[PDB]
Amino acid sequence: PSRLRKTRKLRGHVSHGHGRIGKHRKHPGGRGNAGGMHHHRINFDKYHPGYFGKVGMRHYHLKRNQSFCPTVNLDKLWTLVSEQTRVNAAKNKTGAAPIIDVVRSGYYKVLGKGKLPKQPVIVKAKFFSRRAEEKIKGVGGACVLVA
Amino acid sequence: GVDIRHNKDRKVRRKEPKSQDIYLRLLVKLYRFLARRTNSTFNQVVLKRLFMSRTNRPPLSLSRMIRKMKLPGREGKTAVVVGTITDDVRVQEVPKLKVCALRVSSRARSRILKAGGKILTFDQLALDSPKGCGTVLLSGPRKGREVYRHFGKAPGTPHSHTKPYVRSKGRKFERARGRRASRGYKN
Amino acid sequence: SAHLQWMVVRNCSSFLIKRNKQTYSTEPNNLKARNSFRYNGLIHRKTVGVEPAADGKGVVVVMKRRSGQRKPATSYVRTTINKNARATLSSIRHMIRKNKYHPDLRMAAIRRASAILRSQKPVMV
Amino acid sequence: AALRPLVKPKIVKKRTKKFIRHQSDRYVKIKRNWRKPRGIDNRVRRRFKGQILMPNIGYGSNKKTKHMLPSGFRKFLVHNVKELEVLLMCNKSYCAEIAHNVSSKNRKAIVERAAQLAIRVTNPNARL
Amino acid sequence: ACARPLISVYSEKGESSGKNVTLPAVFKAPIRPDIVNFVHTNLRKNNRQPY
Amino acid sequence: NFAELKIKRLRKKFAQKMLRKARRKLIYEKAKHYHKEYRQMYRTEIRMARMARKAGNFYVPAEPKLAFVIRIRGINGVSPKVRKVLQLLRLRQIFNGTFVKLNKASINMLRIVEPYIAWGYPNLKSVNELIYKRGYGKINKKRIALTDNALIARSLGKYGIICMEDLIHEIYTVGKRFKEANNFLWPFKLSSPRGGMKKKTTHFVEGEDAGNREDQINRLIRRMN
Amino acid sequence: TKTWRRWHRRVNTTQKRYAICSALAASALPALVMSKGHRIEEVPELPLVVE
RNA sequence: AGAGGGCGUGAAACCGUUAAGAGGUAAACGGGUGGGGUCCGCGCAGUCCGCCCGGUUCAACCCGGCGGCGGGUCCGGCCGUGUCGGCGGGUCCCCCGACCGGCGACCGGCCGCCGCCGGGCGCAUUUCCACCGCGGCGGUGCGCCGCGACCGGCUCCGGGAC
RNA sequence: GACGUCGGCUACCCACCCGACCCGUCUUGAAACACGGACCAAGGAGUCUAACACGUGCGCGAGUCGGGGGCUCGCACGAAA
RNA sequence: GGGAGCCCGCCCCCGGAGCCCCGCGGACGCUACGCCGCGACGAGUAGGAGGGCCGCUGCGGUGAGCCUUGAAGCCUAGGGC
Numbered sequence A: 001p002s003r004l005r006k007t008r009k010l011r012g013h014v015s016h017g018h019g020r021i022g023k024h025r026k027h028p029g030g031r032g033n034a035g036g037m038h039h040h041r042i043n044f045d046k047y048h049p050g051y052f053g054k055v056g057m058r059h060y061h062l063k064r065n066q067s068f069c070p071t072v073n074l075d076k077l078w079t080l081v082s083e084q085t086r087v088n089a090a091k092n093k094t095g096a097a098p099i100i101d102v103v104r105s106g107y108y109k110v111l112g113k114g115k116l117p118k119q120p121v122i123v124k125a126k127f128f129s130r131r132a133e134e135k136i137k138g139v140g141g142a143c144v145l146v147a
Numbered sequence B: 001g002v003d004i005r006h007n008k009d010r011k012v013r014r015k016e017p018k019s020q021d022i023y024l025r026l027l028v029k030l031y032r033f034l035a036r037r038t039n040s041t042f043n044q045v046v047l048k049r050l051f052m053s054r055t056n057r058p059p060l061s062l063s064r065m066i067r068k069m070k071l072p073g074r075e076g077k078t079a080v081v082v083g084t085i086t087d088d089v090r091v092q093e094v095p096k097l098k099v100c101a102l103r104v105s106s107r108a109r110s111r112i113l114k115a116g117g118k119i120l121t122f123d124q125l126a127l128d129s130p131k132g133c134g135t136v137l138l139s140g141p142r143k144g145r146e147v148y149r150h151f152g153k154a155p156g157t158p159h160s161h162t163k164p165y166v167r168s169k170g171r172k173f174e175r176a177r178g179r180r181a182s183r184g185y186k187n
Numbered sequence C: 001s002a003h004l005q006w007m008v009v010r011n012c013s014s015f016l017i018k019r020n021k022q023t024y025s026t027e028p029n030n031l032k033a034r035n036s037f038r039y040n041g042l043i044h045r046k047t048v049g050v051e052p053a054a055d056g057k058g059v060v061v062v063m064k065r066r067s068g069q070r071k072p073a074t075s076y077v078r079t080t081i082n083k084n085a086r087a088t089l090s091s092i093r094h095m096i097r098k099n100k101y102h103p104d105l106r107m108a109a110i111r112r113a114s115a116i117l118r119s120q121k122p123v124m125v
Numbered sequence D: 001a002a003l004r005p006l007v008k009p010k011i012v013k014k015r016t017k018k019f020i021r022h023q024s025d026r027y028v029k030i031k032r033n034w035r036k037p038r039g040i041d042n043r044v045r046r047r048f049k050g051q052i053l054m055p056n057i058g059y060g061s062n063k064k065t066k067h068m069l070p071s072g073f074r075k076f077l078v079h080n081v082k083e084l085e086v087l088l089m090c091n092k093s094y095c096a097e098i099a100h101n102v103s104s105k106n107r108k109a110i111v112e113r114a115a116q117l118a119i120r121v122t123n124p125n126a127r128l
Numbered sequence E: 001a002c003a004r005p006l007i008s009v010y011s012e013k014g015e016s017s018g019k020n021v022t023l024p025a026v027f028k029a030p031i032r033p034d035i036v037n038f039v040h041t042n043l044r045k046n047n048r049q050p051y
Numbered sequence F: 001n002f003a004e005l006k007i008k009r010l011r012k013k014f015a016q017k018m019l020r021k022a023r024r025k026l027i028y029e030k031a032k033h034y035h036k037e038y039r040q041m042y043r044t045e046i047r048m049a050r051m052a053r054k055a056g057n058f059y060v061p062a063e064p065k066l067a068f069v070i071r072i073r074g075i076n077g078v079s080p081k082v083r084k085v086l087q088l089l090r091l092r093q094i095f096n097g098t099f100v101k102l103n104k105a106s107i108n109m110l111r112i113v114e115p116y117i118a119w120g121y122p123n124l125k126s127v128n129e130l131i132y133k134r135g136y137g138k139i140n141k142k143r144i145a146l147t148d149n150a151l152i153a154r155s156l157g158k159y160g161i162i163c164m165e166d167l168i169h170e171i172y173t174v175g176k177r178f179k180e181a182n183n184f185l186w187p188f189k190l191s192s193p194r195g196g197m198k199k200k201t202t203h204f205v206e207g208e209d210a211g212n213r214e215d216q217i218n219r220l221i222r223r224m225n
Numbered sequence G: 001t002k003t004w005r006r007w008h009r010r011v012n013t014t015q016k017r018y019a020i021c022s023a024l025a026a027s028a029l030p031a032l033v034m035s036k037g038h039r040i041e042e043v044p045e046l047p048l049v050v051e
Numbered sequence H: 001a002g003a004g005g006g007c008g009u010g011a012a013a014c015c016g017u018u019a020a021g022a023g024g025u026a027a028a029c030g031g032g033u034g035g036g037g038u039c040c041g042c043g044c045a046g047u048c049c050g051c052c053c054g055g056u057u058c059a060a061c062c063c064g065g066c067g068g069c070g071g072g073u074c075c076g077g078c079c080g081u082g083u084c085g086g087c088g089g090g091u092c093c094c095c096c097g098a099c100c101g102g103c104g105a106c107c108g109g110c111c112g113c114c115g116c117c118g119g120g121c122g123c124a125u126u127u128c129c130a131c132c133g134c135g136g137c138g139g140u141g142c143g144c145c146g147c148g149a150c151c152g153g154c155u156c157c158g159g160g161a162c
Numbered sequence I: 001g002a003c004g005u006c007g008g009c010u011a012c013c014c015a016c017c018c019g020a021c022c023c024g025u026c027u028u029g030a031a032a033c034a035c036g037g038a039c040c041a042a043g044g045a046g047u048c049u050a051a052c053a054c055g056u057g058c059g060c061g062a063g064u065c066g067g068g069g070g071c072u073c074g075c076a077c078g079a080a081a
Numbered sequence J: 001g002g003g004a005g006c007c008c009g010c011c012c013c014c015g016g017a018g019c020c021c022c023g024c025g026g027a028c029g030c031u032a033c034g035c036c037g038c039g040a041c042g043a044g045u046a047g048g049a050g051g052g053c054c055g056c057u058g059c060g061g062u063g064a065g066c067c068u069u070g071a072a073g074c075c076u077a078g079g080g081c
């Protein structure tokens, strides 16, 4: 809504809010990102460190499908299964240890962040980390690798 | 002729909510009466937090509220939140709590009612505890938003850990001259 | 809720009157024709309305039944008073005061009835 | 023998002359409507001695007698008899104003109703 | 779960019949004039031809 | 029930009236004692002077502990240090008066702003007229006229100040609670000096008005109050 | 003026449902219907449901 | 045609004439008055009303009818919130009983009250019109004014006493 | 005091006393022997798209979403919903 | 509640105590985005912010709105805010 904008309040003012000493010219400093090395160097060096220069190796034909590996933490692992499955745990006096498949929910890598409740689980994943496996073994479960 | 600076004479604090919704206005009127009449400062704090904006009342997680209520002494007290109570999925055991909040998520509401707790609104709080006796006032993390990671000492400054405004993070977008000791210098 | 409906109706009513610094509400059962929460015949559970009779003599007292809303055809009860300009005021006062039916509007209804009785009289020379 | 108002206090005005625009007398294209001077070198803008006065908040009229007619009432524009009946409970403090677009056929009815309800009309015998 | 009364249906000539329907819970939903105004103003622009 | 409540209310009213009467009697007694004390001090000074003058000796009077400072020039072209001292003395507008307790630090502060102020040693009548005619108390950061002893009591009861006589005693005879009593008083809004001035821009010694006018400040107070 | 002005505006589905529910609830409360100017004086019941 | 063939409405710059005023420091402008015109609002006094008090019927009080208000023994049922019972058909429904929030979600009777209508109530009560009281109250006076007392803030004057 | 008398602050004209240099702009500095300007009418200059950052309001909330597509209308309101 | 005081009992309710406080109900005041009381303060270019019942055009609702017994537009030494 142009009604609520600033241009309506500037009617009658000569400079239109751009000063009368230094007028509003086309491009006093240049167009775009001009002058990153000269006359605009301080802004680039104090707000965008590492802008200039080249680092690392090139990868000509990079495909994101190969590097696709979603991760899930042990902090939220029972959320992938229904709540009644977790309710049917520490119960039945058998040690059921229901199987949790993370590839079904859309995860390949299992990370060890978070606290795992004291209940045996069967976790099947493409990859495992050392801490996650340690937590699962300490709780009383087992890690299963799936291709 | 008196020499007094007028640059800091008008205080900027809010006097009324900027929202136009009418239920918040009714709650504001009720707590205006309660704060201006009752000597309790709890009503004053509730009024001021009702005047606040969305970012000034961040949501309170279920786990944080449970942990705060876990402290000794504050047993059997009503939780008072001026923000929104949000469900926390990485916690399993939820005790029974009495909570007062403007908004409660459907998952959080279901989990609280399942455990046997009570959920109340501020108009019910006024009827139950007009002076706010036996209540614990809580709030969410004010610095929880991602904007504060960009605030503070500017990036590219020694002993600064501020996230710069980058279009996309990657190998060849940053971390070069200005950040590499091999490329010019680093801070 | 009277307050909830007032919050909706306080500014976007069809009876509201702007134009030259005076605000009015021409809704029925609203004495003083004032856009006020107290003087609002649509939102309140109990309302008192005094209007001139259709014949041209006497006044009509309208009170909201309050037994059941959502039924506007039966919500309001109309009673006409046609007496000697002094028993009418006493009748209205006993309608409002002794019945405890919205005592805030007692004197307002009395003054409105007096004005209505004054109106239905010979005008001037 | 008109209808006297409820209260008729003494109305005091800080200023009664109109605020004229600077150099409105010198040119025809410059109208009497006030415009705030904004020139860098303007005698009126920086309040030189013996120049055109500029409107200020100080000239504000007293709130008791603001918008009050010399009789003691306040104008209220009325377009029909139904709108005239609104002023029944404000007759001693407000007076009805008949719109210019109202035809003479309905103006007499409005005047008669106002006389019945004892409301002053600032233009009772307007068109006939 | 607010108190939802029973609404009586009416025949073609008035004279409400014996059938009654309980008030649906939608009529007990909160009234938000600001939300209605926002949605209406933003939605009324979608049936507009370019010029 | 009604009769008992009415009797209780009447008894409460009578008790409040008795308390007010006792407070009035206390104020009267304190004022009489202050009159006696002022007379005793004034007579004692003359006694000591005569006692010293009887023999071949001299009696040096005490350095005054109270001073009254009046700002006698405007707010244009003021040095930063001078304006800082002036605003630390609650003297921001021209022709404003205040009471200053005299010590080494205050004497040096007054020395800094000599061209901007005219000060001296006030009398009992001067402080009486200043506190009575132009006495305003700072209550809730608001300038409230001292039209009743209730305001003075509400402000300085914890310091034993319950009437204007106590304020005059604390100001003229600077005591332990001089700071609170003086800060309670709003800075005096004095009018322009009737009869004109001698010379604003130079010191009182050389015929001007600025500087120390130890005994002549009373004339300025009379012509300004 | 250009034809590629942002003529159309977008509203969340949940907010649209909220607004329609608020309007449906406001269809009750004869005070609000009267405030809209509808001549509802003689209607036997404001939630007017017919066979 | 006060629409007359580039003809609906017909502004400003500019021009002619008529009426009035004025005119040797170019004209013009701001503040304050005065004089003259233009009409406006009175008035053939405008002394302005609105209450209380003094000098043709019904209120008071009964009978009948009608409608409404509030109440509790919840008097009875519905309605309705939380728990307990019958598992009777994770979430969504049925029956009685108990407690409690009996929450404006409705009735049928009881009580008290209010209003209206119809009958009485014939005249020290009751109510309209007009007057002599300016008697008590409130806002005002058509315009020009004057006087008294009280207060607030100032400029002075005359005395006495330390 | 009331049939040629009243009230009309503002506007019509005139007179008197005081004040009073032509506006806009560059400029440390403008009444300037600095520039533009006979007068009047009409038009006339911070917009739109896209990308960001912050603040604010709303809905949902560890989730959120409608891009595009599909099912209902023959388009009056609809190329909507 | 008991024991008692400078023969016992009452020592009562506002549908009436009649009021400078009435805890029994409460404006002429309550468009609570409303109303009311206290104090201090008031310069302004560049620039920033707020309020406009300031003004123009068109669209959705609403004034049982206005109008050939006269709309817009235009002129006015008329009355005002």
Ligand SMILES: [Mg+2]
Pocket (backbone or CB within 6 Å): D029
């Ligand atoms: Mg032009």
Ligand SMILES: [Mg+2]
Pocket (backbone or CB within 6 Å): D040, D041
């Ligand atoms: Mg300049």
Ligand SMILES: [Mg+2]
Pocket (backbone or CB within 6 Å): F076, F077
């Ligand atoms: Mg100087």
Ligand SMILES: [Mg+2]
Pocket (backbone or CB within 6 Å): none
């Ligand atoms: Mg023509």
Ligand SMILES: [Mg+2]
Pocket (backbone or CB within 6 Å): none
């Ligand atoms: Mg240049």
Ligand SMILES: [Mg+2]
Pocket (backbone or CB within 6 Å): none
């Ligand atoms: Mg130069």
Ligand SMILES: [Mg+2]
Pocket (backbone or CB within 6 Å): D041, I030
């Ligand atoms: Mg210039």
Ligand SMILES: [Mg+2]
Pocket (backbone or CB within 6 Å): none
């Ligand atoms: Mg030229």
Ligand SMILES: [Mg+2]
Pocket (backbone or CB within 6 Å): none
């Ligand atoms: Mg133009």
